[PDB]
Design an enzyme around this catalytic site. Structure first.
Site, PDB file in Angstrom:
ATOM      1  N   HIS A  11       0.809  -1.284   0.000  1.00 19.55           N
ATOM      2  CA  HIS A  11       0.000   0.000   0.000  1.00 19.55           C
ATOM      3  C   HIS A  11       0.838   1.330   0.000  1.00 19.55           C
ATOM      4  O   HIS A  11       0.438   2.421   0.383  1.00 19.55           O
ATOM      5  CB  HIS A  11      -1.148   0.029   0.973  1.00 19.55           C
ATOM      6  N   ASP A 104       0.173  10.383   4.135  1.00 19.59           N
ATOM      7  CA  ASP A 104      -0.872   9.643   4.846  1.00 19.59           C
ATOM      8  C   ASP A 104      -1.078  10.327   6.138  1.00 19.59           C
ATOM      9  O   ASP A 104      -0.095  10.544   6.909  1.00 19.59           O
ATOM     10  CB  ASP A 104      -0.389   8.219   5.040  1.00 19.59           C
TER      11      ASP A 104
END
Ligand SMILES: O=c1ccn([C@@H]2O[C@H](COP(=O)(O)OP(=O)(O)O)[C@@H](O)[C@H]2O)c(=O)[nH]1
Length: 443
Positions: A11, A104
């Site tokens: 990811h 993120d």
């Protein structure tokens, strides 16, 4: 450059896929990972540069070294923030001053570091709008801890959630925060200071989650940019058979199976299953009578017995890892027994694959409710009164998606949402428009 900072962890891919689209628009993306990852994995290649920060463990996995999550996150903060500041300066002194950092928001420190260097910031949410907005309501002090079904019912009634979430559907990191204190905090703090960012992006598409995406846009400025997947899978030519065709052995096995016959099975890359839970899962597979591709990771496979391995030889194949997108796109794939992590879920949607949902925690309970109740693309396994997944229930659900009276319902919805996913990412689609707006802003 555009710097891309995923949580250091498969990811990197959604953020990478976003970065490939920015490279199509002429921007210059850099993947920023840990020194350890950079030493022990191949880089992405063109159009990416690579750079690194440290999490305190440049020669071994920090996560393995520090399996307590709060400890790991404090270490990554301390070392990561220092090293990211040093990287922003070294980049500027190399003649590549960062234009924007896409990060993120489980890394808040990264935003503060970048903004203190004068670098624009773009948060990249990798979880569904339905889950993200619940965490944001707690961050914004509109909902107290713990979040309850009553609280979710209000959001439903107010037109913000599109389905009514019960106890087994609300996000456990806020509905049962005492179980996972660090993960509660990380999930809420994503939002603390997000209003300071230049941009807020989410890996979803509006048609999938319309009420939730509209509330995330109005509340947090979040713009949908997904599904952030390879353009091949989205039917996007700008630049059934899979032209991106590998040589992976499990793919050869799939080619021998009949159309729509195979159950893909995975619980992802993070959760762990004990020997008892492996045994229920595997025997359910075998009891179904279907061909199956069972991903059991190398770090989990010591828990598989000889006898259960042998039982799975009849009709199945066990692998430590598979090229999941290529599997889901394959004509032999009939359904996906998934933990319903968001990436797996989006990959199933883009391929029009019905789901059997076996959630653990994080975003997975909520996603699983959407799959069965709003999206209509599968079913969720029912646990017993002790919370145990039984082999009989694994089998029942497989048979219910592949053979049951509603088989065509789950396929019809999967195919409907596939098409809408592809539309969103093609030129002029709702997510493509937001990608193009960001590319032009940073050009
Ligand atoms: O055998 C595997 C298992 C997983 N994945 C990829 O790993 C990611 C798993 O992400 P998800 O959000 O579904 O769950 P997590 O692993 O974070 O719990 C997805 O992109 C998968 O396609 C893969 O390529 N092969």
């Amino acid at each position: 450059q555009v710097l891309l900072l995923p949580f250091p962890a498969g990811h990197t891919n959604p953020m990478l896929q976003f970065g490939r689209r920015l490279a199509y628009h002429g921007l210059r993306p850099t993947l920023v990972t840990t020194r350890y990852v950079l030493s022990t994995t191949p880089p992405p290649g063109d159009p990416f540069r690579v750079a690194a920060i440290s999490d305190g463990f440049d020669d071994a996995s920090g996560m393995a070294a520090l399996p307590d999550p709060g400890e790991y996150l404090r270490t990554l903060e301390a070392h990561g923030a220092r090293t990211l500041a040093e990287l922003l300066l070294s980049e500027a002194r190399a003649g590549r001053p960062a234009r924007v950092l896409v990060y993120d928001p489980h890394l808040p420190w990264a935003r503060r570091v970048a903004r203190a260097a004068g670098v624009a910031t773009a948060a990249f949410l990798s979880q569904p709008c339905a889950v993200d907005l619940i965490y944001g309501e707690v961050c914004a002090r509109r909902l107290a801890l713990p979040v309850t079904p009553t609280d979710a019912r209000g959001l439903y009634a107010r037109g913000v959630l599109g389905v009514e979430l019960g106890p087994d559907d609300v996000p456990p990191f806020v509905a049962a925060p005492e179980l996972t204190p660090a993960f509660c905090e990380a999930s809420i703090e994503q939002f603390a200071g997000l209003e300071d960012d230049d941009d807020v992006l989410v890996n979803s598409f509006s048609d999938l989650e319309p009420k939730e995406a509209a509330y995330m846009e109005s509340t947090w400025r979040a713009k949908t940019i997904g599904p952030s997947l390879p353009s091949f899978y989205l039917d996007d030519g700008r630049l059934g058979f899979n032209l991106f065709r590998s040589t992976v052995p499990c793919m050869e096995w799939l080619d021998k199976q009949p159309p729509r016959s195979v159950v893909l099975v995975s619980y992802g890359t993070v959760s762990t299953f004990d020997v008892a839970k492996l045994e229920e899962l595997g025997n359910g597979l075998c009891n179904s009578g279907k061909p199956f591709l069972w991903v059991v990771r190398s770090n989990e496979e010591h828990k598989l017995s000889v006898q259960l391995r042998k039982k799975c030889e009849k009709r199945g194949l066990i692998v430590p890892f598979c090229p999941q997108l290529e599997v889901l796109a394959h004509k032999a794939t009939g359904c996906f027994l998934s933990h319903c992590g968001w990436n797996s879920t989006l990959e199933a949607i883009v391929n029009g694959v019905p789901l059997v949902a076996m959630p653990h925690w994080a975003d997975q309970p909520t996603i699983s409710k959407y799959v069965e109740s709003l999206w209509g693309m599968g079913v969720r396994v029912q646990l017993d009164k002790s919370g145990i997944l039984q082999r009989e229930e694994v089998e029942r659900c497989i048979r219910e998606v592949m053979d049951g009276d509603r088989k065509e319902d789950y396929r019809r919805n999967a195919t409907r949402l596939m098409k809408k996913a592809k539309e969103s990412m093609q030129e002029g689609g709702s997510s493509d428009k937001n990608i193009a707006e960001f590319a032009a802003k940073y050009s």
